[PDB]
Every structure is written in C-alpha cells, then in structure tokens.
C-alpha cells in the first residue's frame, strides 16, 4: 500500500561536489524505520543509513540522512570516486519493507569526442548465412550519442542494437557498440555500409564506411 | 521509605523489585563509602552488596555519602548525596558531589555523575524474537528527577530509539537516536548511540536491556550543553 | 569476520526447482532474523522472505505463494531458500541478509535464471581493422548466439587489459544473447604483436581462443 519514489533517477556530478537525493513516501511514515543503501557496480547492496539519520558503522561522515513526514534526503558532501553508485531508500517498518526504485549517481566530466571504427562481417561469419556489421564509439562523454546506419545511403532502422559500457574507472568515459544484422543475401545486394555518428564532442557528424568485399 | 532499613536489614530474597545491587564502580578497592539516612548508617567496600530490596520502585532514593580512606583515621575525599533509582530488574546509582578537599580543609564543588548500573542483564541470545516494545521511565540529573524517558525497541530489526522530555533545562530534552542492539563482552544485550538535539549531534547514550523478557532498559546519556557535558541517568520499563 | 557466504542457484526451465544456501560466520546466527532479497536484471530490490530465530515463523512476499519456502539450520549456521514452480519472473539475483527489514549484512548474491531456452555456446568471430585513427587501431571479437549468461572474455590469456572494452550483453529477438569485445592498440604493433580473444562460456563448457589478424 506504500510506494517510495526516489528522484532524480540519474545524476552527474564532479568529485568534491555535493549530491542531494530525494526519498518521498506516498504516506507519512515513522523516520526511525527509514534506511538508505548503497549499491556499487556489480556488488551487493550495503546498509548506509538507518533511522533516517543514523550512519551504519562504516559509513563516513560525508553522508547525512535527514527529513521527516514524507521526505528524506541523502546529502553526500565532497563526493569521492567510491561514492558514485546506486542509492536506494527503504521503509522497513513492516513487510514488504518496500525499497525505492533507486537513484544512479554518475561522474560528471568534460566533453570528449568519440573515436569511431566500423567493422565488416568476417568471412567466417558469412559462411554461416548471417552478416553482422559493427560500429565502435570509443572513450567519449557525455553518454548521449546518435548512431545511424546507412546502406547505399539508405538509412536503416529496426535492424540494429546498441550496447553501452559503464563509466570507465580511469577516465570516466563511455564506449558504445552498434550492431547491424542482415541476412547474407541482403548483405550481398549492397555495396556501401556506413556508420554515421553525431555527438556533442564533434563539430559535425563523423562517418566511417567500407565497401563490401574489399 | 525504607532508607534506614536498606542500611540495616540484611538481604531478604522476598522483597520487591531488584533486591540487591553490587557496588563496583561506586566504591573502588581502596575506599570505603559511608551512607546515612534516617539516623542509620552503613559503610560499604568495593563489591559489597547494597540492599536495594528495601526500597520503593520507580523513585529516586537519597542518602548522604562520604567517600573515605584510612591513610591514621579517615580522610574524606568527597561528600554529598547518593541517589539510587530502583526498578524490578535493574537499578542505578549516582553521586551528587557537594564537597571536595584541597591541598590547603574542604572546598565546595558541585559535580554529578553516574556510578553503577546493574540488574539481570538480558542475554543477547534470549531477546524476544520479534515484536516491538515501548518503555517508559525516568531521566534524572543534577537537581532534577522529573525527566520523562520514552524508548522503543524493535527486536527483529535490532533497533532502539527514543526521547528525553520535561527536564528543567532545555538542553537535555533530547532525542535518543536510532541505534542497533549488540552483544556485550558477557553476551548481554546493549544499545549505544548518539544523542540528538533538534537534528544535531550532541554526545552519546548507552542502554543495557534488563529482565528475562526484556522488561527494562537502564543506562546513561552524556549531553553537550552551552556549559559543557552533563550526565543523565536513564531507566524505563514496559507496559 | 562477520560474513554471509552464498551458494546454489543456476539456470532452470519454467516450473523447475532450485535451492539457495547462505552460510553465516562471525556472529551469533541463532539470535537473528534472516531474510532473502532479490534484484531482477536491471531493476531494483524486492524483499522475498524472512524467518525468525527459532526457524518456524516465516514471512513471504505476495508474489511467492508457497512456491518458495525459507528454512534455517541453527547448528550448521545456515539458511536456505527452497524454490519450486519457478517462473521466468523469478529470474534475478537473490541476496541473503541479516535482520528483519534493516538489512545490515548481505551475502554476495547468487544468480537464478528461469527460461525455456536451452544452453548454447557462442560463435566467436573476429572484428578486424579494415583501413588504418592515425596511431591507434581498434580490434575486437564478436560473441554471438549464446544462452546462459554469462560469457567471460579476456585477451591474450589475460595479459591484455589495457584498452579493453567488453560490452554488456544484449538479448536478440532470437532469445539468444550477443556481445562484442574490443581493444584499442598502437597501430605500430599490428605487424608485430599477435592479439587473441579468449571466450569462456562455462554453462555450456565452451572455450574459444580466436585469432584477430589485420588483413591486406
């Protein structure tokens, strides 16, 4: 009967800045039973705060929980790189101990233009009747990027899938792959396969292409 | 009531409430503690048993005290009032100093401190499994035994929290912040957390859980005031 | 030294059964309530179940409906989730945790996947440079049509990590997963350093080391 809504869903800040996360309960609630958990990339959740304002035993001073009634705030001052993670609030007063949907805290950095590479299907793959064409966007920021496939200048849609990595641990950039799938037949009926990339870091779109069978 | 009885009547295991309290941190190995009231008197050494059985429960009981050493005859280091708060399964001592000696024969200082907390410590592994209990009792300090102590413990969550109210100085009507229940060195169940005053941290508090069914809590709180640290005594029980 | 160590799990077909186990260390196990929480791939946490100290009082979320049952063993210091009648909606990572509600210690989590699809090792294809950035070349290898996740890719038996990006997997319309792994290397080393991608898909016991050569 009780929903916990966290805002904002995602968020970028530089190290040393201060994060301000919201936990809103659909009804008024008792603050002694409000918890915040931290979940880092690929790890188990970790109790960070309970009773809305008490720190768990190894939560450092820069985390502070607060609020009452229907709003609770996690204020993360002086962000260290280990603090970029997902944060969930929870009302554990009784079952089902509802969690919020979470808030993802990511690193803010300067714009970096991507390196773009295009890869033709392998001969070995063509033997099996399928052609995957792959476009690589490497080490860029922010995450927003437009990738557009063109086959003999015909714009493709519905025949590709993108994948994006998590923020890199060293330079805080993203990478992205876009894969265009065609039948071997369809692939051998066209010559120019191009990957068009538009992104904040480029002054105008970059295009990588190859000519089939060469 | 039975102050003079407590000083004279031997230990009787059919009196009410906590029937005895061992004086450990009220008397060190060197000293003797003399307590008097209603014309009776008794001297206790370290580890001697004080007969809290002869006293009212849920009240503060007042004795005048003298803390002596025999280096010749007596040398009294401290004097003032000695207060016991008795519950059914736990009890506290306290010292309201009034006089301390000098190298000059006796100065005049006022200091208040907690001495002994004792009783039937609830063992951590025999707490109630679930449920939530509400405890109510007193919070008392220097020249004030009118404080009201509320506390709540959720056993399956292993969490306690509460508040001190209605004390004469405002700087001690404090929230006792959410803290977990942990085992003791003797596997007793203890809570120890932060004191909070209008959302700000202002020291610490400690609570032991007492009784076979965790009927009582007892312990102390240290609170920071515009004039420094002040010790509070804490004892509450269940409905 | 306070620890929760999990085991069990795996892939099962709909309506099948599994067991999770959770071994406790460094704290008095019998004193505590214990719980299971799950995270569906890409979503948030959801409490599943908890059990009292004595081991007979057991709470379940409304989606459980007697398909999953919780138990504990207070002398082996362990906890179990018995999973029957599993549905694809039960796919997720399941964590054991201490206490009721206030989860102050968590196990490392174990993966339960419920699908009708069958276990299939991937095909591995090279992603070869075609025309020379300036001094940086990109290369990679494509890992296609495998079921049980996950696949682990490494490069040159693990000696190559500088410049590697192994993309997260994507479910194709076929209901089979696919991914690419790429690496950027100095272009001056294309002619002298051999690059090989190692693909280990443990659920199908498939292992593919695969050469990635520039062509010309």
Numbering used by the authors:
A (entry chain L): 1 to 214
B (entry chain D): 14 to 84, 86 to 118, 122 to 256
C (entry chain H): 1 to 132, 135 to 218
Study text:
Meningococcus recruits the human complement-downregulating protein factor H (fH), enabling meningococcal survival in human serum. Preclinical and clinical studies have demonstrated that fHbp elicits a robust bactericidal antibody response in mice, rabbits and humans. For the first time, we identified potent broadly cross-protective anti-fHbp human mAbs able to compete with human fH binding. To elucidate the molecular basis of this competition and the ability to recognize diverse fHbp variants, we determined the co-crystal structure of fHbp variant 1.1 (v1.1) bound to human Fab 4B3.
